[PDB]
Design a protein around this nucleic acid. Sequence first.
DNA 1: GCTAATACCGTGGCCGGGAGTGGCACACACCTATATATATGTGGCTGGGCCGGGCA
DNA 2: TGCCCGGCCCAGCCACATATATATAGGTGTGTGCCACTCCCGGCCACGGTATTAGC
Lengths: 132, 138
Amino acid sequence: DLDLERSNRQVWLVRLPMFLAEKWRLGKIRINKSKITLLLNEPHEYDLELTKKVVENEYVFTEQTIPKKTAIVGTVCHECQVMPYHKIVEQRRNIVKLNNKERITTLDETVGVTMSHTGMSMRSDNSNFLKV
Amino acid sequence: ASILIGCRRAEVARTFKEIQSLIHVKTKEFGKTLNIMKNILRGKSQNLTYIPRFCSHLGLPMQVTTSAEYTAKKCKEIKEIAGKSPITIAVVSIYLNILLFQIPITAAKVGQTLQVTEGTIKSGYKILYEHRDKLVDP
DNA sequence: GCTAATACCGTGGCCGGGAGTGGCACACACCTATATATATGTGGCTGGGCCGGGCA
DNA sequence: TGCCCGGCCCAGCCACATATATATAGGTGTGTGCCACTCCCGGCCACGGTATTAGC
């Protein structure tokens, strides 16, 4: 019983930066008449570019052979993209290029203990696994 | 039993609880098969080596190893108790030679590492402490 | 120079028979349980003594 | 500042393995062989496609 609710609704698609997007996982957009920005809550303001002006054949639907409950939302109205104290963001972007992994740990003991635990050590059982 | 025989022929020392820890042979039938196998070998015609192995299990210096060697030989010459299997003589010998120095392991750690009873190493440490007189090398 | 006809080869599914596998029977071999001295050992309970903590 | 209660540790003690013989006996497990059931393999039957030769 799929039913189109309206589709008359106009939605704008946004390609956000990763820290603010993962933070969204509220602000106030200021539309300047051909340049629009965004005043977030304390914090930065963001210019959003008119990425694609004409954006037809693109729509938005939601879901509530196996038919399921399908509802239609609205048409896509404009393709957009948020563009960006920027030195701290640039330093964080330089800082993300410092990921490393831990190296192999060298056991420093007297060897004879570990080598005793290798072969026969007069210690059996102590763990239930495939014991039937 | 063939592995144990090949161990006794090559002057190597492996305790029954070691091969028993490797293979579950139920001990008794292992002893009978080892006995009749020894009879087969006789028909087709030494605890000192255990000391460096357990000293390797504990990570002890060479002076404690040769000290437990002289202690093992002397204790083999003094008689009294004679042995009660050589494993306990080895562990109480290393126990005395390590209580002579300052490297601390106590009785619980050496009893859970070498799989020996604490009451047995203390029972042997009593009479061993009684024979402490003639066991000094230097 | 152009047209028409005939034969042979290869795959897939099903059924039957054999074979294998499982079960049953029989025989043989193991494998338990009890007493005796010996020692010596090891692991788990029993009783007594000592130590630690809290409240008025 | 003093008194009472509970828990833990140490010293110890009992039971079961190791080795010796022997009888009892009576049980259990394992192996082999045969026969029956299931699975696999082989055999049979059906259907479709491609190439070559001869005559007027």
